[PDB]
Amino acid sequence: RSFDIYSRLLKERVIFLTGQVEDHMANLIVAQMLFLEAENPEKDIYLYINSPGGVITAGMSIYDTMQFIKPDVSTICMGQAASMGAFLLTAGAKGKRFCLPNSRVMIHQPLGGYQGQATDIEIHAREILKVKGRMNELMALHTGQSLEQIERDTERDRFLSAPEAVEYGLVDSILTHRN
């Protein structure tokens, strides 16, 4: 009886990624993902996305589980998919990634901040550059775009309307009307 709306939508194999991406909320998407694999490792899974990004590693826990699990993971971004939100979005299974008409996307680069000794600082700094780069490769690969474009387009906050994210390979098309 729509006792719990989301639990109910989990029976249509739909999952919601909303807001701040961080460990726990991420973990709750993983746990859903896995649960759906088992309930049926053959049917498609739905990941709706309206988020501004967040802690990356947490963000990556979702990503790897989207690949790891048997079923294809379709993604539909509504409202906004930014930074890490844009990533998991374009990480949907090819041909199954969407954008509602006025949703909007944003890309940019790994953000961070360490504090301590010079020695330690080079350590964590070298690390963020590696991640900055991997994230760029994994993005080059899901978008079909060169490492040059990503690198340039992601050095600074960059926005895309629904048409443009399609035109960029980020999502495959625009769902305008449930026909």
Which residues are the active-site residues?
83, 108
Dihedral sign of CA atoms 68, 69, 72, 74 in order: negative
Residue of the chain from 65, 74, 75, 143 that contacts its own copies (CB under 8 A): 65
d(CA 65, CA 78): 22
Q: Rounded to the nearest whole angstrom, what is the least distance from the CB of residue 63 to its own copies in the complex? A: 6
| CB closer to its own copies out of 43 and 152 | 152
Near its own copies in 78-107, by CB under 8 A? 78-80, 95, 100-104
Asked if 42 is part of the footprint of its own copies (rule: CB under 8 A), the reply reads no
Q: Rounded to the nearest whole angstrom, what is the least distance from the CB of residue 58 to its own copies in the complex? A: 5
* 70 secondary structure, DSSP code: S
The alpha carbon of residue 178 and the mean position of all alpha carbons in its chain are separated, in whole angstroms, by 23
Amino acid identity at 164: E
Asked if 40 is part of the footprint of its own copies (rule: CB under 8 A), the reply reads no
Asked if residues 37 and 70 have their Cβ atoms less than 8 Å apart, the reply is yes
DSSP calls for 137-162: HHHHHHHT--HHHHHHHTSS-EEE-H
Near its own copies in 158-177, by CB under 8 A? 158-159, 161, 166-167, 172-173, 175-177
Near its own copies in 125-154, by CB under 8 A? 125-132, 134, 138, 146-149, 152-153
In whole angstroms, how large is the CA radius of gyration of the chain?
Answer: 17
Residue of the chain from 48, 75, 83, 89 that contacts its own copies (CB under 8 A): 48
Q: Rounded to the nearest whole angstrom, what is the least distance from the CB of residue 6 to its own copies in the complex? A: 6
User: Which two tokens mark 57?
Assistant: 């590693």
